[PDB]
Amino acid sequence: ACPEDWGASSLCFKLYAKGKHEKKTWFESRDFCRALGGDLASINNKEEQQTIWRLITASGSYHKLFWLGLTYGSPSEGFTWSDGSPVSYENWAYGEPNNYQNVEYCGELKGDPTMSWNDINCEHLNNWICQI
Ligand SMILES: C[C@@H]1O[C@@H](O[C@H]2[C@H](O[C@H]3[C@H](O)[C@@H](O)[C@H](O)O[C@@H]3CO)O[C@H](CO)[C@H](O)[C@@H]2O)[C@@H](O)[C@H](O)[C@@H]1O
Ligand SMILES: [Ca+2]
């Protein structure tokens, strides 16, 4: 059972699309989700991707960018999820991750129907999604 305000399919997810001045870095977003007892959202299969897409449609958060729990590990690991669990299912956008200019070590979701991922600099301010 998920809490009533969390979207379910299982993992539970919640969108945080806040004011223009209330976005957070990847690390700030991770700390926020962990303070709730959860973490930044991981997308581990097509069912979880659909759960989050339907959360986006229900909110009207179209076109927005969201932090996911994607973080680059060691060179041999590549991207992992924020709790260290491995990236198995992937939905990177075309050409991604491209580590553009060698400074992109966190992952963001483009919240449109493609639900694609991009690596981006971790100090960008974005919306975020938590899991619990
Ligand atoms: C926005 C960026 O998109 C991918 O990086 C691509 C890169 O983006 C350029 C964009 O074309 C340009 O309008 C903007 O002013 O600067 C961006 C770079 O920060 O463009 C190159 C072509 O030169 C490639 O197509 C890159 O894929 C994405 O990978 C980045 O993380 C970022 O979201
Ligand atoms: Ca990129």
Cα 36 to middle of ligand 2, angstroms: 29
Q: Which atom of ligand 1 is nearest to the CA of 120?
A: 31
Helices (H), the chain: 26-35, 46-59
- Give yes or no for a contact between 71 and 82, defined as CB atoms under 8 angstroms apart: yes
Method by which this entry was solved: X-ray
C-beta of 100 in contact with ligand 1 (< 6 A): yes
Q: Which atom of ligand 1 is nearest to the CA of 96?
A: 29
Q: How far apart are CA 132 and CA 127, in angstroms?
A: 17
| Boundaries of every domain in the chain | 6-132
Planar angle of CA 2, 68, 96, nearest 5 degrees: 140
φ/ψ region of 82 (left if φ > 0, alpha if ψ in -120 to 50, else beta) reads: alpha
Q: Which amino acid is at 40?
A: L
First to last CA, the chain: 11
Q: How far apart are CA 100 and CA 120, in angstroms?
A: 8
C-beta of 99 in contact with ligand 1 (< 6 A): no
Cα 59 to middle of ligand 1, angstroms: 28
Two tokens, residue 125: 């301010």
C-beta of 120 in contact with ligand 1 (< 6 A): yes
C-beta of 39 in contact with ligand 1 (< 6 A): no
* Eight-state DSSP code of residue 92: B
Q: How far apart are CA 107 and CA 121, in angstroms?
A: 8
